[model samples]
Target: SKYSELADLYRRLEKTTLKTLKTKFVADFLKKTPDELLEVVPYLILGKVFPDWDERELGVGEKLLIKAVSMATGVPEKEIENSIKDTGDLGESVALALKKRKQKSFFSQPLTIKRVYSTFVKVAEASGEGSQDRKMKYLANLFMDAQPEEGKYIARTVLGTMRTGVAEGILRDAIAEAFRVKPELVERAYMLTSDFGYVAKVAKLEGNEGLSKVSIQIGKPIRPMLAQNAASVKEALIEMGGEAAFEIKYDGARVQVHRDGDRVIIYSRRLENVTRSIPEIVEAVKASLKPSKVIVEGELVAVGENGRPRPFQYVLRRFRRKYNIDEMIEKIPLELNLFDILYVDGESLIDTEFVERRKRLEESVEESEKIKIAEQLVTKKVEEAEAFYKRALELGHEGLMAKRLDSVYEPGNRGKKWLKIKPTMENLDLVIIGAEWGEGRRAHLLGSFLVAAYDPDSGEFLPVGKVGSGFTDEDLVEFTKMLKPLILREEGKFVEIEPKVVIEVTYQEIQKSPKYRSGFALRFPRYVALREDKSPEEADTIERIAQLYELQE
Candidate 1:
């Protein structure tokens, strides 16, 4: 198929905000795609080259991409820069440059889907000496063959800035609709595999039986089970059938340890590989685990000289460090607090009861100073749970996690089976979708952030309110640096950003108002902290906000 076909679909997707219409467009496209292209189409439509769990990225930056655009369109570098400034988007600038181009390549051929996808693979695999030039050349070759509309999407896709709002949920529905499979089956397969493209192919070729056969495997990361907020210890116990197991909620990075023989790999909550970042955890897993093939979930916390957990930021620094790792090992020691076991010796424990899984986790590991089972207490009394929660906080932890004894682990499910109890008022996890520049001395920074609540049913982000307070000067600078690369468009001091960053915000009250698209607003919302562990899909939903409003006094 021609790459222009996909580009035309993107144009249509961007022009509509209706969720059903978007899903229908994608479903029709998926039905028309050939079987061989099924695997790549899902990822491409999401503006990604690889599955969510794969660690490989295109690694192309804005400057390098601009050079590729210039090379393809025969536009001067300075003029391209001016175009970006005027349009507030690199993809738009590329499109405009292509429109104004006076020269055409006599040897140019139409870009095919296979050619474009394979070239991107080459760009991602390019490495070492002159790799940037190699990447630029591969990209420019594609742009040289791309039509003006194709150039627009090609640029956005390369930069990871496709703003079509076609989220995972929508894509899952489209695949189900296109292949005539149950949406639940597709969703289950997706949750287990973390690859909707693979699921789409299976759903098309083998239908429901193939998706039902999907199961947990070693070396493949399953989505971590999520916890919902509980108002108090009493509520948690009552909800858990008058009994629950409470574990200390360590403030650290959540890691999934996959061990096959002597090899050990660690994945972060986002399913990105972190095996190279923490060698100590790898060594500890190899030495401690009894099973050669196993997958377990844990919290990797940085510990101080006093043998106490340090701030969460310390763990992030350790994860982000690429050099002097041995030195970092000595500077920031880490402890792995194992919680659940998902697989063991070619068997999956995901369907097992919580107590059974916890028992398996405890029996499979030889506890050491660096690796131990999470601190836990099982009780039916609220008094005991309260003491446990208090002890956790006293030990400098965040809060407590309450899990039902008989509940099965549901991957990627944020249900009431597992509840989180914190000391402060419940906060909403919101996604930053846009921002505005500051005034006077802070003029260079994005001072105010526009946040929105997620509507899972529609796969849309509805604006709730803007937050400008609760940021330090250093925070403003850091946030500005982080959001600059995700900028989609700008109009004067205001800019729209890709909805990627999640922040936990505290508010005085939730109100029914006509100011926002969600038909609601927040009163006096203030930022608490950046939720690095969460994805935008995990942000508080519009339904949750409505629930809170009704529960408010």
Candidate 2:
């Protein structure tokens, strides 16, 4: 069913990538023939199959998987490893790995669909002390006896990381390509099973018709969804392209509202299907909806004293939790920024473009107190977006988010159809009083700079804040190479420099006085555009510093 020469493509997709699943090879796989579909399966299921701890003991990961798969199908392990280097995901590897198994036909091999389904249920239901060990053994035994390579994958599955990056969109594309139906249908199938690899199994048995039964299953890994906040329209355009829909990235917990025959489940942005976190939302959803069964997406942000949205992270403390339910509810009353709708009544809406999904969502919610349609911008004007971005930030919000207006949601990929931009500058010209070496990317650079503001009375430079946050990875790499001449002494937590160099710094906020050995501390400091404008003598004075400090009060 696959091109015989590169069967290991499945394994290759699990381990290496410059970015999320947006590669052309992956796209081709989703849009191409059986070669793609077959390859993606192994990448998806192998993790839930193998579970990580069982696989790494003996050079057993990608290499071992390739060898076993090659042995079964006569494909070379070298080719498989090569593929693994490209994809970096195990699910894709397992899909390719499956090619070598001696199957009776295209769909015949070591295992069957019923057995696959039963295995998951059985493993999930298993309990007791040695149950995990027994489960691992059962998985290895199942793979060794029937589909050996698949067994390796199953081992990886239990370990997690299916390795192929078989995120939601990847499987959706695979299913759409394999079945010739919309990706939304495929999403429905996988969501039900909480397993992307199951698409291949179900398809082999009953084609697309069999997939309808697949529905969201509890206690299984589902693709985590993301929300966006843009600080400026220009930032949004750069990421999402110029034609983006400017949506209010509400300050609240992201909620995926689902009503299956009065069974209401609201999942957080973190993929915790928090059925109990917000009973208010559940009650509001149940009472407001026209259709009985639905699945929709929105942000449930908390409101502040002035009726503005608070940070979404603060509200997340209430989800997947064991204590302080009522207290948090009292402290952070949530307001839903209902935006995208994934499912309506019996139909899935994820396939529809942003425009369509938004329309359906607006129609469904109809402006209720608990549910407000997320405000959006339709233009590409960056200045207009900057105004919104500034307002959001001024109201103690993060920034603005611009998202692709026409792009369909690509779940599980940090797809660039969305971007966040804020109106914050990085570096300002300041005198360096001291310095410290940085770690990781910064490594040994005299990176952390103790910047000073001028004082006229004492005619002395006073330290206010130390900035070390902004250097780009490339900048950091080069900085480590360039910082040899400035190093002086090591002072435990920091490095000291000769204070000869005057550099600019950028930061989010200038907080009030603290005992920083300097007068103040800067928040969220990063590197801004360097000001090569003036000499160290012309660097801002301590009087100016006092003014900036007083302005904060």
Give per-model CA RMSD: 16.1, 15.2
Residue pairs with backbone overlap in model 1: none
Give the range where candidate 1 is weakest over 10 consecutive residues by summed lDDT: 99-108
For all candidates, the clash counts are 0, 73
Runs in model 2 lying further than 4 Å from the true structure: 1-193, 206-232, 235-243, 306-308, 423-504, 507-553
Error of 1 at 146 (Å): 2.0
Tens-digit lDDT track for model 2 on 1-553?
Answer: 3222122444556455732443434444444334334534434323343222111122234444454445444457676676566877654565555545545313334464345545655656666675655454444434534443454445455445445555546546645655565566667565444545556556555566767666444333335444444444665676665667776554566666767777776766555657677787788777777666667777778787888876667676766455667777787777777767767665755556878887787777756778777787777677777677767777766566666777666565455666666545333577666767666755555566677765555656677677777767666555555445665776685766554556667766677666654467666666665544665567776656556667755
lDDT per residue for candidate 1 within 1-553, as digits (tens), equals 8887898889889899898989999999999998878989999999888976676789799888988888887787888889889889888888878876635654578898999989989999888887999998988877877788888888888889988789898999899888899998988888888877678889999989988988885776898999988877898999988989999898888989999988888888888788898898789888888888899999999888786789878888888987887999999899999999999987788989999999999899999878888978999888999998888889888989999999898999999999998755689999999999999999999999999989999989889989998999999999999998999998989999999999999876678999899998888888899988999989999999888888875
lDDT, candidate 1, residue 379? 92
- All candidates' TM-scores? 0.75, 0.48
Best by lDDT: 1
Q: lDDT value for candidate 1?
A: 0.88
Q: What TM-score does prediction 2 earn? A: 0.48
